Amino acid sequence: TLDSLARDLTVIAKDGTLDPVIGRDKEITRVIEVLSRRTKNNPVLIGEPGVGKTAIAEGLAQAIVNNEVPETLKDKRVMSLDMGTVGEFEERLKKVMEEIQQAGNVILFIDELHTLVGAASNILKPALARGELQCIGATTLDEYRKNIEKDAALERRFQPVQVDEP
Amino acid sequence: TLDSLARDLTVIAKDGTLDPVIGRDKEITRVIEVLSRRTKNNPVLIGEPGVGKTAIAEGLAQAIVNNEVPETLKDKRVMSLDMGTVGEFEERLKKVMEEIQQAGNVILFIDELHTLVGAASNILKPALARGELQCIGATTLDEYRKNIEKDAALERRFQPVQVDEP
Amino acid sequence: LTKINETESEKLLSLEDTLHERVIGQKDAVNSISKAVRRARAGLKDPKRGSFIFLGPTGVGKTELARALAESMFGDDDAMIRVDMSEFMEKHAVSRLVGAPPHDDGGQLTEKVRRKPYSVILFDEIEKAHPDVFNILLQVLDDGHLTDTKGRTVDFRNTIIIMTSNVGAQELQDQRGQDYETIRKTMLKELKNSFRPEFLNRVDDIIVFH
Amino acid sequence: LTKINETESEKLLSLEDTLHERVIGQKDAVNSISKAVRRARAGLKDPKRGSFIFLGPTGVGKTELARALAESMFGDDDAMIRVDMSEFMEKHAVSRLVGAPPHDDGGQLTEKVRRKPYSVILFDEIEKAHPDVFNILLQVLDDGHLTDTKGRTVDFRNTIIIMTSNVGAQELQDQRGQDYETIRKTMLKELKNSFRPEFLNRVDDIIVFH
Amino acid sequence: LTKINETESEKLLSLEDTLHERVIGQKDAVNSISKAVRRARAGLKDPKRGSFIFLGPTGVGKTELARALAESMFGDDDAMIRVDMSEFMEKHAVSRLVGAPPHDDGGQLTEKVRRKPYSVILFDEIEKAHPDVFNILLQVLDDGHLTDTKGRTVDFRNTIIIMTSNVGAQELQDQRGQDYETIRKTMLKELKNSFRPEFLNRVDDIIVFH
Amino acid sequence: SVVDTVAILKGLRDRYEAHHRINISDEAIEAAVKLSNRYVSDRFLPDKAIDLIDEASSKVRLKSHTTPGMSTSLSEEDIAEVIAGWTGIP
Amino acid sequence: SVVDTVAILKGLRDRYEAHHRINISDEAIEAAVKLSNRYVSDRFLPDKAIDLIDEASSKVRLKSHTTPGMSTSLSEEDIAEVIAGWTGIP
Amino acid sequence: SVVDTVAILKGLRDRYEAHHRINISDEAIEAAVKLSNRYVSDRFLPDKAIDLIDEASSKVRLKSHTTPGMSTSLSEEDIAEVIAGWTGIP
Amino acid sequence: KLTKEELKEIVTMMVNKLTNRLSEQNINIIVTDKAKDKIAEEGYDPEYGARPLIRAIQKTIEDNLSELILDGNQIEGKKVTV
Amino acid sequence: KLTKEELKEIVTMMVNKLTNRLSEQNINIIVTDKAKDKIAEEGYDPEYGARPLIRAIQKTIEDNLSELILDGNQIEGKKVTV
């Protein structure tokens, strides 16, 4: 399985499918080192949209396939979220989580809307809050003010980081 | 499948079922060139209702069947929305989306009410937000102030354009 | 290099002649400031406890200093936070400190400290601001940390705060080159007017600009 | 250790020299306070019934005492509750006592007592607060417990309350070292002005700071 | 065509005879203005930094010019913003600059600049407006950008601002055809009265209408 | 930073020109970088440059795409015209 | 208590170093224990130490993981740097 | 009423002691009844007594459960200690 | 008191905005201490401090530039003053 | 009235925060009555009381420490003063 919404750009980076980044290295060094944490492997980003952040993500993935990733994570692999929908919807999105938790070998980057939704709220957020499953978020604070914060335990789950326009 | 609500006027234009437009050419040139964008293929329109805009749409479709459409889109084809309803409702409307995403060959124009609804909200809007499925909207800003904007990522999904009364 | 060297005394030891790289005059105050912020170490005062009332005009370096301070101290001036006492009236306490119904908003410079725990805080003819703020000003003076509307209490000692006064604009007529001790006293009570001393008593020291 | 020892008289017996560990002056008041809170036991007064009007300035220990009090008494100062009489105007009774339509909100310091049944309550130049509050102030004075907007009535006797006055700021000119009995009287009526005695009559006693 | 041609010197080079297409008199000022706005380029002054005090009457082209200016410059006059100094009294600073409790409202002409970053700003016998505004006037003069009540700081240099004075209505009696240098001086102090020079010192230049 | 942008634009320099079959002239590239940063609030020079760029890359291609030989993108007009098309007063 | 934490950290001392292939120096161990307790409100020294630790254990490994020989974790930097990386003013 | 509670506690008197293998001393029983009512707002003496009781019944058993012979529950400590364990100042 | 030092010293950093912005215009800058001081002379006021200097400078200073911006005789990247 | 007693007496407990916190830094402390008094001299004000003392002290006091914290010559657990 681990397909459809489940996808990765790391091989794609080893496939050279994407762009060598610059300058967010030590920025990524943080984002990288977020995974180190028994507490929170899981960073989130703030900043200006469309600026390269999901490539900054890929920057990790490069540095991953570059093995600029140090040890523990080197086995693990990017997952780039896919967003879409189809009776219920999220249960799928709920479902994949054990799969990747079953994967023992990867990481996902949650992308932008980390959502306070109508149909929602805690979705993976407990399995997030399960204290497992290394993952990454990003947004600008304007959203960040809410979901990660209004819990604050997802704040206790998430590590915020932001970088200015280069 | 790809029928009922799924319909197209392009062949109808090749069928000559409709009216040769005028003057919105370079206007359409924009609307056209919206599709070019890896970022947003998906325009929305502002302006005065009933003025020819959905024919302005058809204007594209003509220029499509005219092959005044340049390369990438030339294979793709108009879809003119059908609005109606029938247990649940939207799941159908939700359903068709993969179908047309499965179509590998078309485009849909979403028409006017791009809706903040009771039963709603994100419907395709994630699959919209999926960063796939070239489509077009239109309204007057009075609505535009909300759905595309209140997300702003649908703003990040939608490109607004408006044209005055000719 | 500063990241490199910063031994934890190179500033201090040189801090005057460090600071002297910037603005002539108030060398003492400069020194005092240097003197002051050294007490920002050693913890001989309250380890949770940086408070400076500028007596001076425009062009007085009030900005410069404060700027250069962390620009010297924290190796950048963006640690600083402008805060307009003109904008301090009655209810901004919320917009100082998180509301939570009354959206939920707090800190013009806080969330920035929530952003930036090592910072500098500028206030403006500060007594211009209302007896409203003096207590939440006192909040700073309180405990040397900063509570929030959500309650979060955060260290000031890891930042700086700045107070400015033109109060002696008249009394400046003295150094407009007279012995400041006149105007020092003469402004002291004058500002001492505006503040219960306890306010003034957590000050590092009052800062003339002559 | 206090958890251990707290025999129920070690404070008391030592409470002066206990308290004396803190702030010089008002030793009597200190004593009185010690004297006072002992009546917080024995139930010879109303077992439901801790009320202290501070006559004093900034730096007067008004805070210290009150702080140290439970910090002494309840072995922490977080029992205390700051309450700004500046913030007591007309309708805060709701924000004192649960609304329920008018959200539903009640107690700036209550829900905190709903949080913390053993506490201390600070009020500010209290007569500064409105004849609005005096009755809900009287609510405290009432019955020695605290009703709520949801109705819940909770013991004050298991907490402390604090009243502060600079009223004699002038009349302080006396001890600025004159016999306080002048200003005592002289402030008494002055504050007695602001309050029907019954208010004042549930006071433990008025607290000068000299 | 202007969209087409606008090489970035055709205005300038012709700007006089450009402007000369409009209002006779103040040709110098016209020139000066032309001269002025050229400094709106080259960034030899502060790239963030367009400030014109009109000395003149009704019919004086004060409007015309300002109108035509961007109508010349920005190829439209709707860049302009009328602002009534009569309407500038004490608290409009909010209605100048976003409130946020005090709805939340800010900028009679700002949000319009928030709307229109390239604009023109008209003020009215401006000293008629209050020492209230001079600082938020100075805000414009400040930094050559515009902070907001939400804090947003936006470039003035990408817009124009206009100041008007009938102050010399008397002193106009001079050019009612006398050498203006009299009234220039004669009005200068007179308006210099109303303003700390620093205000006046970010002016492009004072604009007579003769 | 504006400059890093140029580099990151230089990153995508080959990209959309190999999409748009044109030759990017860094003169333009740095140009809008300043200019957009100057003139464009909303999107970000990390993009909005490329926005202009690709759009310029279009406008050229547009002209170059159909009836108006230069395959390269000029500095100026590519910035300018488009940017003037963005605003005015070239 | 801070100290018991050290012990419970000593409990996991072998744990993540045998994950991170490093040598924990109790000097560090007690260090952050104070230091985190000092500097970190949110997570808990029962963890946040180890947080720092493992993170330090990473940062070393990071350096040690790839191009920067010490396998052991220093007292200071492991605390300090990381903790400075946490905050500043080492 | 506090007293009826005692009776209803006397009702469960055999109950949890036959669960906790102890001997309830009504002295305690009435004690907390007052005391809890005095000191405990939230739960209700119909229970909270027994709460204390069973908890006391635990605390004894706890001591009695494992290494600290009295099977009976004291008046005081059973109330007191536990109640002091509840609050303080025995 | 802000010593003669400070005066001309600030007179320096006064120049900064010029350079840090204009020449950052890109136009070389010459400095005549005398005038600078003559300026600084009139630059510092007791009461207002030298604070007018901002205005003080710009008036003629930006001018002569703006002037010599026009003058076509000696032009950008040069330097001239009074 | 707060007698000379009180002044230097409070000047003591003034030291407490230092010790009760810093040396609780762990750094021995010497006290020069003269200076202490010279301080206390300038320490007490009529109007504000000695209240400035807090500031008064810290300024130089914490400094010379912080200084000698740097000075590497005579260091923690010693004592020096003016």
Numbering used by the authors:
A (entry chain E), B (entry chain o): 162 to 247, 255 to 286, 295 to 342
C (entry chain H), D (entry chain N), E (entry chain B): 488 to 536, 539 to 591, 596 to 669, 679 to 712
F (entry chain D), G (entry chain J), H (entry chain P): 343 to 410, 466 to 487
I (entry chain G), J (entry chain M): 713 to 794
The authors write:
The bacterial AAA+ chaperone ClpC associates with the peptidase ClpP to form a central proteolytic machinery of Gram-positive bacteria. Here, we report on an unexpected mode of AAA+ chaperone control involving transition between an inactive resting state and a functional hexamer as revealed by determining the cryoEM-structures of S. aureus ClpC in absence and presence of MecA.
MecA binds to N-terminal and middle domains of each ClpC subunit forming a separate layer on top of the ClpC AAA ring. Additionally, binding of MecA to MDs breaks head-to-head MD contacts and is therefore expected to prevent formation of the ClpC resting state. MecA prevents MD interactions and thereby converts ClpC into a canonical and active hexamer. Taken together, our structures of ClpC alone or in complex with MecA show a dramatic reorganization from a helical resting state to a planar canonical AAA+ hexamer, explaining ClpC activation by the adaptor MecA. Once formed the hexameric ClpC6/MecA6 complex is stable and does not dissociate spontaneously, raising the question how ClpC activation is turned off.
